[PDB]
Design a protein around this ligand. Structure first.
Ligand code: MTA
Ligand code: SO3
Ligand code: ZN
Ligand code: ZN
Ligand code: ZN
Ligand code: ZN
Length: 270
């Protein structure tokens, strides 16, 4: 009630509707916020990236614990409310689409993630140098992020998560926890950078996972013909490709790496 009332009061004070769009929901539970923050072990030395501060409930908690918070927000009207409603010495608001603007240097991310950017944000983050991220997604998307090779929901996002991160779902978050109540539950995800990162070619993985249900001979032939190359000058090389008895969705990052190295050696991806 206490944080839901306070939301209701802010929205009417400014006279703004709770969403311009349809993949956006406001965390209105004090203890989930404080749980996100204790899971990330935010300390007086940390420099934190937040995305989509909304009405700044999470932001405000981060500002009182961290050295510096950078928070990225697309809606210029939200930004004006944040500036009038709060008095942080150590918060830097960046107007922008979080998927497009240059990110600050940070050592951690503590953030609710607007669900519409769940995928693009995650790929961008997995390619950053951060100590620890604690982030909220829909539960379906979080189950994808920890899907195992050869399982039915395993996809490009799963591979890159496994290849580049250690990913833990920390707990379910009930739909009661946001306004307006989502139609499915969310999940609090911990991501640390993998100690021994497997660095894979983006174009290759996109190629392979364009249709992840195919065998890897098939997947490779199609993607490289689509680029504009002859089929005849590609067939024989592809049919000594390693892991060729797998469908793409069954591939470990290690196996994708061998396909890369193989294609690299035959000058296809160079
Ligand atoms: C976290 S759920 C709500 C907040 O996310 C913000 N938001 C939505 N989409 C984006 C985006 N692409 N980049 C940054 N902030 C966003 C909205 O303005 C809202 O305040
Ligand atoms: O609108 S929410 O359910 O993505
Ligand atoms: Zn405050
Ligand atoms: Zn689905
Ligand atoms: Zn053709
Ligand atoms: Zn194999």
């Amino acid at each position: 009630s206490k944080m839901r009332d306070r939301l209701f009061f802010l929205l009417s004070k400014y006279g703004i509707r709770p969403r311009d769009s349809i993949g956006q929901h406001f965390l209105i539970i004090e203890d989930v916020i404080e749980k996100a923050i204790e899971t990330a072990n935010v300390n007086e030395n940390d420099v934190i990236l937040e995305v989509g501060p909304g009405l700044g409930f999470l932001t405000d908690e981060l500002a009182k614990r961290a050295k510096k918070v950078y928070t990225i927000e697309i809606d210029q009207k939200i930004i004006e409310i944040l500036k009038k409603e709060y008095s942080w010495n150590n918060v830097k608001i960046i107007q922008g689409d979080a998927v497009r603007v240059e990110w600050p240097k940070f050592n951690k991310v503590v953030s609710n993630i607007p669900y519409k950017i769940s995928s693009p944000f995650t790929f961008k983050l997995l390619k950053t140098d951060f100590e620890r991220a604690v982030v909220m997604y829909q539960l379906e998307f979080a189950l994808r992020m920890v899907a195992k090779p050869g399982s039915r929901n395993y996809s490009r996002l799963s591979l890159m998560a496994q290849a580049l991160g250690n990913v833990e779902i920390v707990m379910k978050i009930g739909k009661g926890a946001f306004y307006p109540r989502p139609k499915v539950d969310s999940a609090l995800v911990l991501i640390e950078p993998r100690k021994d990162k497997i660095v894979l070619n983006e174009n290759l993985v996109k190629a392979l996972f364009q249709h992840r249900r195919k065998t890897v001979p098939r997947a490779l032939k199609d993607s490289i013909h689509m680029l504009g190359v002859s089929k005849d000058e590609i067939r024989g090389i592809i049919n000594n490709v390693p892991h060729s008895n797998k469908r793409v969705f069954q591939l470990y990052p290690e196996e994708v790496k061998d396909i890369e190295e193989y294609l690299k050696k035959h000058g296809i991806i160079s």
